[model samples]
Target chain A: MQILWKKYVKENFEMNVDECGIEQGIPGLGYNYEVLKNAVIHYVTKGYGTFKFNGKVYNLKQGDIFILLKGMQVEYVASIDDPWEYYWIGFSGSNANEYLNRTSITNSCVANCEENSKIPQIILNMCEISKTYNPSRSDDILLLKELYSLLYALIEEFPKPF
Target chain B: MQILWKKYVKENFEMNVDECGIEQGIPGLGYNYEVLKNAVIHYVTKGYGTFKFNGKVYNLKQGDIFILLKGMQVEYVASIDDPWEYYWIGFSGSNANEYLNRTSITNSCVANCEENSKIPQIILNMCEISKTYNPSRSDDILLLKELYSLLYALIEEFPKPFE
Candidate 1:
């Protein structure tokens, strides 16, 4: 089982980057050869791109969010004309799957942001909280505490269907 | 994440047992010390039992079905005096978790079957299918075929919000 294991519950959490941004036509970071090892979520803030996952191609635009699950042979690129700009947060833990399930974002790669939605603002908040974070779980739980805020913001933004 | 990996997909299926039965107060078979490595489903048909799984205890009687997920520290025993009788199937594979989820039997250890249901018959049919079937059944795909019958029956009987 890919995501199924006795030890994958809470003890396994890896955040490759809390603050990351990609501009159109980036040289080294644009495409990947094969399936990814960790879950990657891209919240598109501008423009468009195309993602090929599980042999299917998805056209993504502004306000689009796509989750690339682990072990998928995925190839993606930014659109040449308009290009795509996005903020991404990569996370995996025991509860991450359940959180995704609750969001009801399955069956499709992207979700168009509703007009006047607060999702963009929430991602901005995530960047601010995480930029100062140093992965510290100290007595203060300072950076760690802020990560909770970031996590809540994401799930709050990704609401379930009616 | 349980059914996430592509390699761990539908191809991997192992039947630890084709058909098995247990009665109440059977010393060695009654209680368990820890979580099982494979998926265990019990179709309780007679009497009573109690299962302590994942820190919750379920009082099981006739017409109750319980599933024990892999690696859960679970202990179960039939009622001492009255005892219980059950037909069980043990399986492990890529689709086990998803099938269990589809039946709407998650979180709780036991699901109550109605007074008139075809589920127990399905398992009984499974026993008949496997009882005289040796390695031949494994080859003919009949074993696999009948397993599908058992699966669909339970899902057909046990449904969304338990139907």
Candidate 2:
């Protein structure tokens, strides 16, 4: 697997974007079932993958998004042939769950984005900002902009029944 | 002036969306030069108006957004004939300026949104949520989503140049 870029940042609001990365997964690469401390959302930017969470399995492809909630056991792997490239953002806060719970991904763990969704552009913006490590407080705020934008995109795609 | 809807909310992140509203400006109505404690963003959803800041004046219309930064003197008035209708979000935080400083609106206090900009939809979402006030924790987080989305939309429209 190749890590194109990765960066960690401090808290903003009650939410903190702990780390984010652009990863090009190798064929057959997989993570065994494990729980995490912070929540993560992975957007498949290119290729395909398989994700297992909450006893449900999902085949994900470009433009699809999956969530790995804190304290949830999950497993995911890159497809053997096509492999996959994805951008992931990990975040946590005292109220992070409140936001995550509102997105439909929490129920199914994966979903396709709406046509013309801006999540990809937002992720690329995060990667561009990540090229500079130990970013200034200004960049940290920029990352929050991208992070919040990502959440808004997901919420738009998988809106809760009102 | 007619108030369509208004709601006040508490802090989220260090940022607090202190209040937001939909207002229909009456002909000749205006706010004279003044500074506010929190930053306010006004989006003209209908009609036309004028905004003044730092000795510069801008004629605004639908899809146009203007900022009233904390501690900045500004004046604004509705057009006597067409008047104006706007959506406004007022926010403040310890680190709010850091984010606000990055958007070009701070340079001139106004800018036009891109075609298909999502700021209008996001603002409507906030207003919809506000309809049910004293919101639950979940709604508060939802408001943050809309607030951050608004910030991102502005940043995308008025990005700071790379060094």
Candidate 3:
């Protein structure tokens, strides 16, 4: 798999939205197990793929979201017949775990969104806004807002009772 | 109009999320001219109403949203027949103006959202999370996150060119 486009956002305060972008994979392309420094959330926007995390293999299709948490070893491969394309955001915060705990992403780190979900648009906005990433106050707040909205959208998709 | 339920979140850092809640109006109920201390965004969830801002009258229905910027004079009244119900979030920040600049609320301060939009759910989540609002650091971050998401949802609804 190769990243078609990706943009990084400067870190600020206790939260840092590292980057967000879209990637396209060739048929049967796969990545070996590796650890990520920042937590990442990938939403399948096209095609199908197999994602391995915590010793479980999840067959993901379009509209599905798979999370790659910091320090976790994971692997993924595109479908031989259809391949796959996805949008993702990488981020970390002082309270990243606590914040993530608010959503169902902590349940199994994977779930499919509702039909015609706005999540894809939200993720796209994340990438678009990061194109002009800056360390200024307004830009920091702007990135912060998008990051929160992105996670909140996931929370909406995967409801967990308090 | 009467406030059916409302909850307030604590202020922290450069941003302050004052409160959010739901309001149900009686038929023909209205409010006089008043200026808000914090910028507020209200989304109509039911019925119909008329909103007056900047010398213009906007007839709004369910799924429509209206923004009340800090220090802006605004008035709204329910329809004589159907009344109205709405969810609102009140907030302020050092860069609140710039943050709002990213959304279309500045254009006319009123627009309808997409059908079956998740904005209502996002707003409801803001209210739910603020129920246990506190001055602790974690709660502050939680409230801040929701405030940003709420505004972003509005941005998605009413897009604008780069500012």
Candidate 4:
């Protein structure tokens, strides 16, 4: 049988998906926002927001990181007084949902800005490497290796509270 | 975007593949080859054969296991004097090739067999469960968890001597 190798592309920091906007008093404007097949990690860099999930509201501050799994229903409302600015990464694959489910931040966001500041550096470095080394060549193995390391770092940084 | 979950059928016993036949002048034939877009493991149950790979050849024997990466050229030859039979499992994804490259048995065909024999129960149980569970509806998370465990087991079974 002829076996064909599968291929995928890796993204860097500057290439990530980010958005900012003003809230116009929409209670459920972003309610039930389904992440679909991709898992997302949202870092609220500015403003304050209340995330309503599982019947409770999670108030997030700047530097707070929240993880959303595929197919999850979430709603966010900006504090009437201030809008929110956030940076996020959306990645998907066979293991995306699996890793998210096994993560500790499923119910609540974990604060890692202080203890894990170096984590972001690692991610940025990987992104730069991926950009430098085009993923079209057969040797995209290095890029995938870096991505696996990044994922491992994320897993190690956010351990489940036992 | 619309997100749809795909379920994959997991094979029970580990499987092996190759272009079997063409050695020992026995001229034996009857091998049906199967292909899929994933990583597969093949276990040599009987006979002796040569696995033609990457412009080279590696000999095989009973109880041998080797990994076939996606898009790699692989063929098998069995001698009429000694026939070969083996089992295999098909699995794939973004990280499949990376995992295989890390745990490749390219240096020697029989390196992982001894270690693989130690986990007979793990393989048997996985196959049994796969028979009853519909892969389409089976929890992808749980399946991945089990698969990782199995992959680690194979890794632990074969140390770095081959490297």
Among the numbered candidates, top DockQ falls to 2
Best-to-worst order by lDDT is 2, 3, 1, 4
Give the residue spans of candidate 2 off by over 4 A: A54-57, A114-117, A132-137, B1-5, B21-37, B41-88, B100-163
Q: Residue by residue across A41-141, what tens digits does model 3's lDDT show?
A: 89898999999987999999998888887667888999999988988888886545556777767789888888878788878787767667653324566
Question: Which is better, 1 or 2, measured by DockQ?
Answer: 2
TM-score of each predicted structure versus truth: 0.42, 0.65, 0.55, 0.39
Model 3 residue pairs with clashes: none
lDDT of 1 by residue, A14-112 (tens): 212322344444423457666454566677877778878777888888877776776767777877777777776555544345445555455564566
Give the Cα-based TM-score of candidate 3 against the true structure: 0.55
Across A108-129, the per-residue lDDT of candidate 4 in tens digits comes to: 6445465446455544454445
The better candidate by TM-score, 1 or 2, is 2
Provide per-model DockQ scores: 0.01, 0.24, 0.15, 0.03
CAPRI docking class of candidate 1: incorrect
Ranking by TM-score: 2, 3, 1, 4
Report the candidate with higher TM-score, 2 versus 4.
2
lDDT, residue A29, model 2:
81
Question: For each model in turn, which proportion of the native inter-chain contacts is also found?
Answer: 0.00, 0.35, 0.23, 0.00
Task: List where candidate 3 sits over 4 angstroms from the true fold.
Answer: A1-10, A131-140, B1-163
Top-TM-score candidate index: 2
